[PDB]
Amino acid sequence: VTKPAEVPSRIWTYVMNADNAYGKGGDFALLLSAVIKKESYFGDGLSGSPSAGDGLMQVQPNTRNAYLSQFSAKYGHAYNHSSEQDQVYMGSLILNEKIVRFGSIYSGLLHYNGGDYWYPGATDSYGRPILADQYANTVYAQYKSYGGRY
């Protein structure tokens, strides 16, 4: 498992630390890279969007709020939204939780993006349509393009 050429150095460190926290041997870091690419384009695709303030993994305010105590338990410090490493840790925690609970990567991605109760036509906290199925397909492909085994 090596860094994909297109993934910026700073991002790779973030996702690799997150991977170490879950004991995933570099593979989760590949999945998180794909997630971050889609969500924020490594931080270059944030401006212009109403969800810009939501950071690298685009975790929505009410979702961040829901997982605050769990984040602190997992990582030993309070979630700091100004920290990019924390943004990645928070996104990783939520994504891991969906994958473990729903039983697969594809489904974890789908429900990461749409919530547990996503249906076609459902909108986000900004009123934008959530295309959770398409999100999952393209992010799963990218994870595989990066060399993801599972």
Ligand X SMILES: CC(=O)N[C@@H]1[C@@H](O)[C@H](O[C@@H]2O[C@H](CO)[C@@H](O)[C@H](O)[C@H]2NC(C)=O)[C@@H](CO)O[C@H]1O
Q: How far apart are CA 96 and CA 31, in angstroms?
A: 11
Q: Minimum CB separation from ligand X for residue 121, in Å?
A: 11
Which range binds ligand X by CB under 6 A, 4-12, 17-25, 76-84, 117-125?
117-125
Q: Find the largest Cα–Cα distance for the chain.
A: 38
Let me know: does 58 contact 45? Beta carbons within 8 Å: no
Q: How far apart are CA 14 and CA 92, in angstroms?
A: 10
Q: Between residue 55 and residue 84, which ones bind ligand X under the rule CB under 6 A? A: 58-60, 62-63, 66
Q: Minimum CB separation from ligand X for residue 113, in Å?
A: 6
Query: Does 110 contact ligand X by CB under 6 A?
Result: no
- Rank residues 2 and 62 by Cβ distance to ligand X and give the closer one: 62
Which phi and psi angles does 146 have, rounded to 5°?
-80, -15
Let me know: does 74 contact 93? Beta carbons within 8 Å: yes
Query: Does 51 contact ligand X by CB under 6 A?
Result: yes
- Rank residues 68 and 78 by Cβ distance to ligand X and give the closer one: 68
Q: Minimum CB separation from ligand X for residue 124, in Å?
A: 5
Q: Minimum CB separation from ligand X for residue 36, in Å?
A: 9
Q: How far apart are CA 8 and CA 93, in angstroms?
A: 21
Q: Minimum CB separation from ligand X for residue 60, in Å?
A: 4
Q: Any idea what the Cα angle at residue 24 is, between residues 23 and 29, rounded to 5°? A: 120
For residue 129, give the DSSP letter.
B
Binding site for ligand X (CB under 6 A): 38-41, 45-46, 49, 51-52, 58-60, 62-63, 66, 112-113, 115-118, 124-125, 135
